[PDB]
RNA sequence: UAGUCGGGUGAUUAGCCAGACUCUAACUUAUUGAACGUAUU
């Protein structure tokens, strides 16, 4: 039984969450049931991978000077075999493939 | 694990003979270049990046004193007892954490292909390959147990997370097939399989792609 | 002596003090400047030239530990591990050591606390004694202040002695110099799990004065704070501020000005009230006119509380009902302290207590919360919702920038806000013979909580004891057994996943993805 | 400590201890020396010195029982990343013995004071004594001081 | 509890005349008496609430006065009572008149 | 608390709502109600209980309605008196459970 | 980055300049005795 986060004390009924919690990943429960972000919002480094993705999308999927700098920052802070860096690498690879498809379609 | 190709003996192993000599005497830094040539910076058993590392006797020095300065027997394993205690997979766990084991009931990655015996599910678990019975099943089951390839949470977690990062790409490549011809498509699969050669958990990534 | 003179002139604090004591000007000023000198950094924060912090701790045959060494950070050290790994033991050991400094700042030859002969000696230790050894640092002029607390087991004929004289020597400098000319003094505090208590406004301590400066050291290492003392002190501050006539005149002047603006805005109903207030102001001005340090003290604490405690936007004293009541604005509603949730109250109590002590011990600082000291907090996440766990360390460090914090936690959410260098981690199957604690391999600051669970806290992100947690794995295996086609068995499990997790679940999407990929792989295999 | 026989007796009582630990250290390429109650170990191999304190405790217990014990508070690890000294002598990062920068700077201060006739007789005597020690530990320092301050001044001082 | 007329009979024939009870009572009365119609007071409270930061103390005082006025209005004939200010003054005068050398 | 009191003693009184803490601060009606419904098999599908408390100024008294709790508890008590039966466990473990252990064990009063 | 080493300069235990190092990781100590260095003989 969950209280709504914005409850100003006038909620008539307490209700079950929409997501099934039993057997679910912790990260999902935090976000969907407890309304807490997976990364701490008050830390700059928490936003870097998000920002990196946005930079990739802004430059038609190519790794520009700005995207490279941020990539290097991610690599330097989180490390060579970090989840964050692997996600960044994945984004680069998928965007390159998407662009190749787009070029083939244009020709 | 990956199927390994052992090339050539280093010269330093010729001098030291078991009974007379003990493993403290040999220079490890002479041996490593040939192992790093073979393995490519990654652990023999779990395929993680080597940072804390040690040279590992596949059949141990206590039980098998004869097999000590023998080039077949040696492997580069993750973890290092000198640098820190409490390491819970691969070489260290084989000796300390796992109890009694038959050395014959283990996949040796130079002798054999592990792809015959092991399967890497995208949920991150290593399981015996489909259609194994008796001796081949026992070997697949024991290799998993003795090197702790699921039971180490650090490894399980890392391997799972590595695979789930690429699964948007696996689903995206294969959707583009009704679009494209076989000549151009098979290049792109080959380009993706070229990338993963220099990545951690490359067998787990291969089974996701192929 | 000429030897002491040479060392003192070289910058040694203890030599300078020895010369001061024997010749009882120059040497006094050296000692006082050593303690008081500092500068404001680029961020506008005062920084002492000579920092004070615990460098190193060693435990020998203490509780679970046979021999353990810990190196601490100057700013923040977080200790993590499972229940029963000795995290609380470590803070207890430190608190007892700090009690020797507090005792000797209060009294020449004061006695600090002792290790228990009944409980603190390791049960299966062959030698039947324990040692807690600490080294403190106080600037480059006093790089090492070693202390050892020792105790032999009950019954044992040989008794092991403590070595506390260096603590006493340093604390003597603080005490003596302060008596001649006021200096800022260090804060030492322990907040253990005993801080969670029911509140009682009706129980009052009639044991010492609360406005006396050295009351700041009263029960400082007892584990609960003294939130009752805070409330008494805060009411005291309020009464003094209200009684000060110029501030009352300034406040009355402000009220008259606000009321005059309302009357000028067309509200003729408040004209009677304005006339009454104007009369009161005139009377106050007529009565003999003379900034209270008390007013500033009050303001500092209020700001600290409101900045650190997220649900609290304001705190104030009311007396109009005929009993002194502290009220707070909590989530936009005015409530009494007794009305606060346990989580909010306990956290408020911690910050209020600490701020009070720092204000009392740092009278010469512009911002007294930039004073020196060592604060120990056990289970920082106690009673906090995950949302608050994401803010608590950041808020504390910003409010108290020169305190050395030594904290324990079970929260991955808290760890996500902290650098790896600050973390000290028990090895997973320790059994109390580990010699040195180390930091984790993963960078925690900014990392996802699920990764911290698995990589640092050694816990699966999905509960392994729940069958439903394995359905996706089982589903995948079934799909791979039937060459990628949904057979009867795989379809049943798919339907179970759909029924259990729902149509929009991540789990079902993963299952759908598996189907799509495997179907496509099989088609490729057939073409080949 | 104040008795003339006590040095000899104490060294003798540590004879067997020194034999055993020296032999053990030599096998793992560790240099070992003892100056009275001060034990020093050094090596070029990383992560071998960590085992030494445990080895010491066992040996002490074996030979002396509970009579002689390690002062665990005084066990210190160092490297070229940090300050290293042995019995009040600094080992610099060029692997040479040194008085240390602070002591050298202090000596220079005293010489400068002497140059302007500001040293009292007590301080002068002190300076002379300390220069003899400096000459024993770091003769090159004396050469440098001669260069900085005029051989004449230094010779006059050492008269 | 709030003070009520027939508290005057409580412990009147044993337990009366105790210094600590007086001091507590006297301070209480002082705090209440430091610093109008209900409708007028209701209007003033409403006007002050609309204005509400420096006037917050005044609003709280006026709300208290309103509550007290309503309570007095609601209170029964059998418990009719003089204002706290008057009560205080009478007691002070009694003490100063009766007790030797207290002026 | 009303079940427990009446299992122990006939006409035992449970715990009341606080006038100071339990009433909502801005309650227009100036009283508080806690209404609970219990189930005890198909024979007794509804056992309704209400705890009530009015604020200090007391325009009208709102009384608690606890008779069904008492009636049910009486059944447990009386039948148990004649022949031993199993009884229900009621317990609250709040955050006050976190407290230090006293070593000093009180000798057996019985 | 920080800490450390220290060649130079500097009425000089400061400050400034130059160069370097990095096993999780120095905290400068004690005489009249003993030994070592210097002086005296
Ligand atoms: N004297 C002792 N001898 C041996 N083990 C002890 C002794 N005192 C406590 N312990 C053990 O030490 C642990 C105490 O944990 P504690 O210090 O409270 O750690 P944590 O706060 O991490 O739970 C338990 O495992 C307890 O059994
Ligand atoms: Mg001498
Ligand atoms: Zn491995």
């Amino acid at each position: 039984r969950e209280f709504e986060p914005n409850d100003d004390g006038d909620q008539s009924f307490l209700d079950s969450p929409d997501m099934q919690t039993k057997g679910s990943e912790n990260a999902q429960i935090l976000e969907q049931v407890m309304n807490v972000h997976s990364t701490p919002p008050g830390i700059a480094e928490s936003h870097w991978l998000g920002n990196f993705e946005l930079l990739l999308l802004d430059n038609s999927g190519e790794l520009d000077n700005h995207s490279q700098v941020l990539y290097d920052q991610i690599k330097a802070h989180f490390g060579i075999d970090s989840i964050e860096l692997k996600k960044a690498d994945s984004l680069i690879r998928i965007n390159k493939m998407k662009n190749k498809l787009n070029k083939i379609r244009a020709e | 694990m990956r199927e390994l190709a052992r090339l050539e003996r280093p010269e330093i192993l010729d001098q030291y003979i078991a009974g007379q000599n003990d493993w403290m005497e040999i220079d490890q830094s002479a041996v490593w270049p040939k192992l790093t040539e073979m393995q490519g910076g990654f652990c023999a058993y779990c395929e993680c990046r080597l940072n804390r590392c040690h040279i590992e006797h596949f059949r141990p020095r206590g039980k098998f004193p004869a097999l000590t300065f023998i080039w077949n027997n040696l492997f580069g394993s993750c973890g290092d007892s000198r640098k820190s205690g409490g390491w819970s997979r691969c070489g260290i766990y084989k000796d300390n954490g796992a109890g009694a084991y038959n050395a014959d009931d283990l996949i040796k990655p130079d002798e054999e292909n592990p792809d015959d015996y092991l399967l890497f599910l995208t949920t991150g678990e290593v399981v015996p390959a489909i259609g194994l019975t008796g001796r081949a099943l026992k070997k697949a089951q024991e290799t998993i147990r003795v090197f702790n390839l699921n039971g180490d949470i650090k490894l399980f977690g890392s391997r799972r997370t590595a695979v789930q990062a690429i699964m948007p790409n696996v689903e995206y490549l294969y959707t583009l097939l009704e679009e494209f011809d076989e000549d151009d498509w098979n290049e792109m699969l080959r380009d993706e399989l070229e990338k993963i050669e220099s990545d951690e958990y490359k067998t787990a990534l291969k089974h996701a792609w192929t | 002596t000429k030897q002491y003179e040479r060392k003192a002139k070289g910058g040694n604090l203890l030599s300078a003090f020895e010369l001061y004591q024997r010749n009882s000007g120059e040497w006094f000023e050296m000692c006082r400047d050593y303690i008081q000198d500092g500068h404001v950094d680029e961020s506008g924060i005062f920084r002492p030239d000579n920092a004070f912090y615990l460098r190193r701790l060693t435990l020998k045959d203490f509780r679970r530990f046979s021999l353990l060494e810990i190196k601490l950070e100057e700013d923040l050290t977080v200790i993590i591990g499972n229940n029963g790994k000795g995290k609380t033991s470590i803070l207890y050991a430190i608190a007892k050591t700090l009690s020797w400094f507090v005792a000797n700042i209060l009294k020449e030859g004061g006695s600090g606390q002792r290790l228990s002969e009944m409980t603190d000696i390791k049960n299966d230790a062959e030698d039947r004694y324990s040692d807690v050894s600490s080294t403190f640092f106080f600037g480059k002029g006093l790089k090492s202040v070693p202390i050892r607390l020792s105790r032999s087991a009950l019954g044992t004929a040989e008794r092991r002695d403590s070595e506390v004289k260096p603590a006493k020597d340093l604390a003597d400098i603080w005490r003596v110099i302060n008596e001649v000319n006021t200096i800022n003094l260090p804060t030492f505090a322990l907040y253990n799990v005993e801080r969670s208590q029911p509140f009682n406004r009706n129980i009052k301590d009639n044991t010492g004065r609360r406005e006396e400066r050295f009351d700041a050291y009263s029960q400082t290492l007892g584990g609960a704070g003294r939130f009752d003392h805070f409330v008494e002190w805060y009411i005291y501050l309020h009464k003094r501020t209200v009684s000060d006539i110029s501030s009352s005149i300034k406040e009355l002047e402000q009220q008259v000005n606000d009321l005059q603006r309302t009357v000028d805005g067309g509200m003729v109903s408040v004209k009677s009230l304005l006339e009454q207030m104007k009369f009161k102001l005139s009377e106050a001005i007529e009565r003999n006119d003379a900034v209270l340090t008390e007013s500033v003290q009050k303001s500092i604490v209020e700001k600290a509380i409101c900045s650190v405690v997220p649900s609290i936007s304001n705190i104030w004293v009311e007396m109009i009902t005929g009993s002194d009541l502290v009220k707070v604005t909590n989530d936009g509603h005015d409530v009494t302290i007794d009305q606060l949730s346990d989580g909010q109250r306990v956290f408020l109590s911690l910050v209020a207590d600490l701020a009070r002590r720092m204000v009392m011990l740092n009278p010469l600082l512009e911002n007294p919360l930039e004073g020196r000291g060592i604060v120990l907090i056990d289970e920082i996440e106690l009673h906090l919702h995950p949302k608050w766990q994401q803010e608590v360390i950041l808020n504390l460090r910003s409010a108290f920038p020169n305190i050395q914090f030594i904290i324990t936690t079970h929260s991955p959410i808290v760890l996500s806000t902290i650098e790896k260098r600050c973390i000290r981690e028990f090895e997973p199957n320790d059994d109390g013979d580990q010699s040195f604690l180390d930091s984790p391999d993963m960078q925690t600051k900014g990392s996802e909580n699920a990764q911290i669970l698995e990589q640092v806290m050694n816990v699966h992100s999905t509960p392994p004891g729940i069958a439903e947690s394995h359905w996706l794995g089982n589903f995948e295996l079934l799909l791979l057994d039937n060459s990628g086609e949904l057979d009867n068995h795989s379809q049943v499990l798919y339907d179970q996943i759909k029924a259990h997790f729902g149509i929009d679940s991540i789990e079902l999407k993963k299952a759908d993805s598996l189907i799509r990929i495997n179907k496509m792989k099989n088609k490729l295999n057939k073409i080949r | 400590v104040g008795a003339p026989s006590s040095p000899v007796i104490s060294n003798f009582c540590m004879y067997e201890f020194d034999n055993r630990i020296h032999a053990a250290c030599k096998k793992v390429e560790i240099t070992y020396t003892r100056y009275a109650d001060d034990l020093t170990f050094s090596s070029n191999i990383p992560d071998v010195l960590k085992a030494v304190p445990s080895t010491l405790e066992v040996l002490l217990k074996d030979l002396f029982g509970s009579a002689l014990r390690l002062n665990h508070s005084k066990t210190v690890f160092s490297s070229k990343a940090h300050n290293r000294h042995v019995t009040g002598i600094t080992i610099n990062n060029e692997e040479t013995l040194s008085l240390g920068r602070d002591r050298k700077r202090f000596i220079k201060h005293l010489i400068n004071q002497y140059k302007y006739g500001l040293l009292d007789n007590e301080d002068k005597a002190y300076l002379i004594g300390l220069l003899a020690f400096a000459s024993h530990i770091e003769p090159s320092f004396i050469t440098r001081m001669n260069e900085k301050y005029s051989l004449e001044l230094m010779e006059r001082l050492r008269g | 509890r709030r003070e009520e007329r027939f508290d005057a009979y409580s412990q009147t024939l044993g337990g009366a005349g105790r210094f600590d009870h007086f001091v507590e009572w006297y301070i209480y009365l002082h705090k209440r008496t430091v610093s109008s119609s209900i409708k007028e007071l209701e209007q003033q409270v409403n006007d002050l609430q609309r204005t509400v930061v420096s006037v917050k103390s005044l609003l709280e005082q006026m709300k208290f006065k309103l509550s007290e006025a309503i309570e007095r209005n609601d209170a029964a004939v059998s418990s009719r009572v003089l204002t706290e200010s008057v009560q205080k003054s009478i007691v002070e005068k009694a003490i100063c008149s009766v007790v030797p050398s207290i002026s």
Side-chain angles (χ1 to χ4, degrees), chain C residues 145-345:
Chain C
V145 182
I147 304 163
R148 191 182 80 218
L149 300 195
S150 294
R151 204 76 191 276
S152 292
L154 187 79
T156 306
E158 283 186 78
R159 316 299 296 158
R160 183 85 176 142
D161 311 339
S162 294
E163 298 166 303
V164 297
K165 172 168 173 55
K168 293 186 173 180
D169 293 344
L170 180 52
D172 282 354
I173 298 179
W174 285 322
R175 192 182 68 258
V176 164
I177 297 301
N178 182 69
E179 171 152 292
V180 176
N181 190 8
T182 288
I183 57 169
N184 299 314
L185 292 166
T187 299
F188 301 125
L190 169 65
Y191 302 98
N192 68 190
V193 298
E194 230 183 48
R195 71 183 176 280
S196 62
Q197 308 173 316
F199 171 72
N200 270 288
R201 62 177 293 289
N202 277 67
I203 306 163
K204 189 178 183 175
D205 183 80
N206 303 13
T207 310
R209 286 119 304 130
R210 299 293 80 76
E211 74 292 343
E212 197 281 299
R213 186 173 179 206
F214 289 101
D215 197 62
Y217 287 122
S218 176
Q219 294 79 58
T220 191
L221 291 167
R226 290 298 301 262
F227 183 58
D228 57 318
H229 290 192
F230 172 80
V231 170
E232 187 178 356
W233 176 80
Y234 188 57
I235 292 164
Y236 160 91
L237 280 172
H238 175 73
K239 287 176 178 165
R240 286 195 57 72
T241 308
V242 160
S243 293
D244 179 65
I245 307 160
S246 53
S247 43
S248 300
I249 291 170
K250 259 182 181 182
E251 255 178 349
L252 270 149
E253 268 177 346
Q254 211 170 353
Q255 279 178 4
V256 168
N257 277 341
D258 285 40
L259 269 144
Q260 200 81 243
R261 273 183 194 165
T262 329
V263 170
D264 294 343
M267 256 180 181
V268 183
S269 58
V270 296
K271 210 176 182 180
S272 86
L273 211 88
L274 180 74
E275 275 210 346
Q276 269 176 10
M277 274 297 114
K278 203 85 157 67
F279 180 54
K280 269 184 178 289
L281 186 70
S282 85
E283 266 198 315
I285 293 170
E286 254 181 350
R287 274 180 205 161
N288 286 284
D289 296 356
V291 177
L292 269 195
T293 183
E294 284 83 8
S295 64
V296 171
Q297 293 184 354
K298 196 183 192 280
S299 75
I300 287 161
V301 163
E302 288 170 2
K303 290 220 311 90
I305 290 171
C306 293
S307 71
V308 178
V309 185
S311 62
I312 299 179
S313 56
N314 195 14
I315 185 161
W316 70 95
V317 181
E318 279 174 25
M319 302 183 278
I320 199 65
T321 61
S323 54
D324 317 322
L325 287 162
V326 173
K327 307 253 274 210
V328 292
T329 306
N330 180 37
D331 301 312
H333 302 288
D334 297 357
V335 293
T336 62
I337 300 291
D338 309 70
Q339 286 168 54
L340 293 174
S341 74
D342 292 340
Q344 290 167 336
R345 194 180 65 256

Side-chain angles (χ1 to χ4, degrees), chain B residues 138-157:
Chain B
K138 180 67 177 176
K139 196 150 75 186
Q141 289 178 106
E142 284 291 88
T143 307
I144 291 161
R145 189 185 63 73
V146 164
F147 297 139
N148 206 17
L149 300 178
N150 299 310
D152 184 356
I153 292 161
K154 284 176 188 160
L155 167 62
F156 187 96

Side-chain angles (χ1 to χ4, degrees), chain A residues 8 19-20 22-28 30 32 34-43 45-46 49 77-78 83-84 87, chain C residues 333 385-387 390 394 413 416-418 443 445-451 453 461-463 466 468-469 500-501 506-507 510:
Chain A
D8 195 2
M19 107 168 268
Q20 182 66 52
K22 193 174 181 181
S24 294
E25 292 164 13
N26 198 67
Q28 290 296 326
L30 278 163
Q32 288 190 63
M34 304 193 81
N35 299 276
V36 171
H37 288 291
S38 57
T39 50
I43 306 285
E45 291 84 342
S46 298
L49 182 63
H77 178 75
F78 292 102
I83 181 176
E84 294 83 359
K87 286 179 168 169
Chain C
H333 302 288
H385 185 280
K387 196 191 287 189
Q390 286 186 329
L394 299 171
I413 296 168
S416 70
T417 68
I418 299 169
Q443 181 68 70
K445 194 189 251 294
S447 298
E448 295 158 24
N449 119 104
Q451 286 285 307
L453 270 173
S461 56
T462 323
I466 303 301
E468 294 82 344
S469 79
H500 180 73
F501 291 104
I506 284 79
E507 292 78 27
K510 285 201 258 175

Side-chain angles (χ1 to χ4, degrees), chain B residues 72-137:
Chain B
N72 289 285
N73 200 64
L74 303 172
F75 290 98
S77 168
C78 70
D80 193 46
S81 55
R82 293 183 299 286
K83 289 174 185 296
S84 59
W87 191 269
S88 187
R89 66 167 180 277
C90 297
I92 292 156
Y93 190 88
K94 171 165 71 62
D95 300 354
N96 297 282
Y101 66 97
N102 187 8
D104 295 73
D105 301 2
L106 295 170
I107 307 157
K108 194 178 180 181
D110 274 299
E111 292 181 7
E112 297 180 288
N113 193 354
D115 280 63
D116 284 298
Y117 300 91
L118 300 170
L119 174 65
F120 283 92
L121 302 161
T122 62
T123 61
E125 190 169 88
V126 60
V127 290
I130 289 148
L132 300 168
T133 48
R135 175 60 55 250
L137 189 80

Side-chain angles (χ1 to χ4, degrees), chain B:
Chain B
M1 338 205 313
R2 183 172 64 107
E3 192 199 296
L4 295 168
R6 196 175 289 287
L7 291 161
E8 199 70 68
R9 195 186 300 287
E11 81 304 294
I12 197 156
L13 289 162
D14 299 358
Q15 288 81 79
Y16 299 88
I17 313 298
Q20 291 279 264
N21 303 101
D22 57 74
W23 183 258
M24 290 181 189
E25 294 172 6
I26 198 159
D27 176 68
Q28 276 85 100
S29 66
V31 183
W32 273 110
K34 291 284 185 289
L35 291 165
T36 308
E37 189 174 63
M38 179 174 72
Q39 286 177 238
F42 301 106
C43 172
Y45 309 142
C46 68
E47 299 171 276
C48 72
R49 193 90 63 191
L50 292 161
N51 305 102
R52 291 179 160 70
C53 55
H54 70 135
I55 302 176
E56 210 284 307
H57 295 82
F58 188 87
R59 296 180 193 255
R61 292 181 286 107
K63 194 176 179 74
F64 294 86
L67 293 156
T68 299
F69 303 97
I70 309 300
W71 178 227
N72 289 285
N73 200 64
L74 303 172
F75 290 98
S77 168
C78 70
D80 193 46
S81 55
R82 293 183 299 286
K83 289 174 185 296
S84 59
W87 191 269
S88 187
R89 66 167 180 277
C90 297
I92 292 156
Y93 190 88
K94 171 165 71 62
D95 300 354
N96 297 282
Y101 66 97
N102 187 8
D104 295 73
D105 301 2
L106 295 170
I107 307 157
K108 194 178 180 181
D110 274 299
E111 292 181 7
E112 297 180 288
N113 193 354
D115 280 63
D116 284 298
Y117 300 91
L118 300 170
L119 174 65
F120 283 92
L121 302 161
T122 62
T123 61
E125 190 169 88
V126 60
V127 290
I130 289 148
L132 300 168
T133 48
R135 175 60 55 250
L137 189 80
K138 180 67 177 176
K139 196 150 75 186
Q141 289 178 106
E142 284 291 88
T143 307
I144 291 161
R145 189 185 63 73
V146 164
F147 297 139
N148 206 17
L149 300 178
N150 299 310
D152 184 356
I153 292 161
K154 284 176 188 160
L155 167 62
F156 187 96
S158 286
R159 189 173 60 228
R160 177 185 60 75
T161 270
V163 169
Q164 292 299 313
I166 68 151
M167 285 295 283
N169 308 20
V170 167
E171 182 152 56
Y172 181 81
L173 182 78
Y174 277 81
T175 51
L176 305 175
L177 193 74
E178 292 296 299
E179 286 279 292
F180 278 15
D181 62 76
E182 292 287 346
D183 298 290
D184 289 293
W185 192 88
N186 279 254
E187 191 65 69
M188 288 201 289
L189 187 76
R190 176 168 50 259
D191 296 355
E192 295 300 296
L193 292 165
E194 181 270 299
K195 157 71 186 296
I196 67 149
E197 289 296 304
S198 63
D199 279 338
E200 301 184 302
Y201 328 112
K202 80 190 96 175
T203 303
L205 293 161
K206 188 179 74 184
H207 294 200
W209 277 108
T210 60

